[PDB]
Ligand binder design. Structure first.
Ligand SMILES: [Cl-]
Length: 293
């Protein structure tokens, strides 16, 4: 499992800010958009992208306030991420796309897809945002932690003061140890405690037990759309998972139209850190099947 990030930086001005992106692969076809979540960057994709780069254009942006994207004094609400990602897409001039999405990236991806259905030729997803209608349905071992995260007081002491999301939650969304080189990559954007607002806001935006209602409403909408959509779907899942337990992958595999679903073996949240070659290989393959009518 490679620790290197051998991608030349690309930058584009988005709403008076600068966002970073990985851009590789053929220039000609349908492009593949990789959207990371919390608390990652395009780094999370580094070992998935080389599987796809040979046949497809690979576009992997750092979300505003993350990776090497600019860090303006925002609240980094979901709605800000939407604003910025909507704009990024239009800046690159993208028309049809395929979406490869994860964690908060999935909420972006689904949300954009709901709004632009005639431009999504496929979606691959994994460990994605769905409504967790009670805290019962959140992983036992992570309840106390995400409960404290969802406080201004101590949540911020943890995430912003202490950097627990990065030093603690992150390694704990991966089954294998992360090396020190890998940790340092995940740490780089958030060395300055100032810049960790995204990391605290995101958990406070998770649609758990009805709140925040704005997020719940919105996630409910994209999931309802997803159930009424033919668009080809590819669902990676792990055991036991975090945001998606095995049992729920099972249910969605069945419930979502035209959806293929691939078990990746041991996995928590950052599936891409536990089995890159498998997800990479399966995406690439599946991509080819989208051209078979
Ligand atoms: Cl989060």
């Amino acid at each position: 499992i490679g620790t290197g990030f051998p991608f030349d930086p690309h930058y584009v001005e988005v709403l008076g800010e600068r966002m970073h992106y990985v851009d590789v692969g053929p220039r000609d076809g349908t492009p593949v958009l990789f959207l990371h979540g919390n608390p990652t960057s395009s780094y999370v994709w580094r070992n998935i992208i080389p599987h796809v780069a040979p046949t497809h254009r690979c576009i992997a942006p750092d979300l505003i306030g993350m990776g090497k994207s600019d860090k303006p004094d925002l609240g980094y609400f979901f709605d800000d991420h939407v604003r910025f990602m909507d704009a990024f897409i239009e800046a690159l001039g993208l028309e049809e796309v395929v979406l490869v999405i994860h964690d908060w990236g999935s909420a972006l991806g689904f949300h954009w897809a709901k709004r632009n259905p005639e431009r999504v030729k496929g979606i691959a997803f994994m460990e994605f945002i769905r409504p967790i209608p009670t805290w019962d349905e959140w992983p036992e071992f992570a309840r106390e932690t995400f409960q404290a995260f969802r406080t201004t007081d101590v949540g911020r002491k943890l995430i912003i003061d202490q950097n627990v999301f990065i030093e603690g939650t992150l390694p704990m969304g991966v089954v294998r140890p992360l090396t020190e080189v890998e940790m340092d990559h995940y740490r780089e954007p958030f060395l300055n405690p100032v810049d960790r607002e995204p990391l605290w806001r995101f958990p406070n935006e998770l649609p758990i037990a009805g709140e925040p209602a704005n997020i719940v409403a919105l996630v409910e909408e994209y999931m309802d759309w997803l159930h009424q959509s033919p668009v080809p779907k590819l669902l990676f899942w792990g055991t036991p998972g975090v945001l998606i337990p095995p049992a729920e992958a099972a249910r969605l595999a069945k419930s979502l139209p035209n959806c293929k679903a691939v078990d990746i073996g041991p996995g928590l949240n950052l599936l891409q850190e536990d089995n890159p070659d498998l997800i990479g290989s399966e995406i690439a393959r599946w991509l080819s099947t989208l051209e078979i009518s």
